């Protein structure tokens, strides 16, 4: 039993992390096959982060300007190109530790494991959720960009995030492995602000389904509610309005427990309108919103890799 924010084993991703140095700028790189992926702002000078000309900066750089270090081995760069905000550095050796991988683009609310890295070496691993404002509430310092977010499905490592920058409010922003930013952010140090952070409602209900599976069902009531009436109470407490598709995402959890989604919604309404009353759920005083329905199924099934 037990439900907790759990990250995937990082052993496969550890073998793909390299350090990318261009002048006085170091970053982390993702080494897959003979290509090293890294944020393109590694070609930026310290005083050239306000409005760098990325196209002009890449032209002025050659293959000898990039120092790629995989542990103690220096990989020679034989090519360089730009794909949106991600730099692609072709190296002369293909990584044998390259696992079966794919590049996917996650959606807000979904979770993924972040392997925090510094100087091309892994520092920590933790589970993050893509917030509704297209940010993540991670713990990133200087030199952490290039760290990747990933999920493991069967035998395939699905890369979905690459760290880039930190927003003024402390939240962090990045792109996918194709270079496309998550949200209306750019890799520029100009005036930028994230949207209003709200509670991912579909994840809170998935957390309630997990507590129910774990035997924690004191919050269950006999009342039912409509989808429209629940969303009126939800947005009053800064909760995301439950869309019709998110009702279907809770399908497997609704079938495994036999509790209808609208029944769990009514239980959340009573919890929001009346509070917890000095009680806890799954050993937590507050409701968690970084636990997707897939995370509930994954932890109660125990799939290995």
């Amino acid at each position: 039993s037990g439900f907790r924010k759990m990250a995937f084993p990082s052993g496969k991703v550890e073998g793909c992390m390299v350090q990318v140095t261009c002048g006085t700028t170091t970053l982390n790189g993702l080494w897959l096959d003979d290509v090293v992926y890294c944020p393109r702002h590694v070609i930026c000078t310290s005083e050239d982060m306000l409005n760098p000309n990325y196209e002009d900066l890449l032209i002025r750089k050659s293959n000898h300007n990039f120092l790629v270090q995989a542990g103690n081995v220096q990989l020679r760069v034989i090519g360089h190109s730009m794909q949106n905000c991600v730099l692609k550095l072709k190296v002369d050796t293909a990584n044998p530790k390259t696992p079966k991988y794919k590049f996917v683009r996650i959606q807000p609310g979904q979770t993924f494991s972040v392997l925090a890295c510094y100087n091309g070496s892994p520092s920590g691993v933790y589970q993050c959720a893509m917030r509704p404002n297209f940010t993540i509430k991670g713990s990133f310092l200087n030199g952490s960009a290039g760290s990747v977010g990933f999920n493991i499905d069967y035998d395939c490592v699905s890369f979905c995030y690459m760290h880039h920058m930190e927003l003024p409010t402390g939240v962090h922003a990045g792109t996918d492995l194709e270079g496309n930013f998550y949200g209306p952010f750019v890799d520029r140090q100009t005036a930028q602000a994230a949207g209003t952070d709200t509670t991912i409602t579909v994840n809170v209900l998935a957390w309630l389904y997990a507590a129910v599976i774990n035997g924690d069902r004191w919050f269950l009531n006999r009342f039912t509610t409509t989808l429209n009436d629940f969303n009126l109470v939800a947005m009053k407490y800064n909760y995301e309005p439950l869309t019709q598709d998110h009702v279907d995402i809770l399908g497997p959890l609704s079938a495994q427990t036999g509790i209808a989604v609208l029944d769990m919604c009514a239980s959340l309404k009573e919890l929001l309108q009346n509070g917890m009353n000095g009680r806890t759920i799954l050993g937590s005083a507050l409701l968690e919103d970084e636990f997707t329905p897939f995370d509930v199924v994954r932890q109660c099934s125990g799939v290995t890799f």
Binding site: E166, L167, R188, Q189, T190
Partner: peptide, 10 residues
Amino acid sequence: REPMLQSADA
């Protein structure tokens, strides 16, 4: 405060 591209020095 401005957003910071989180790349280390040296």
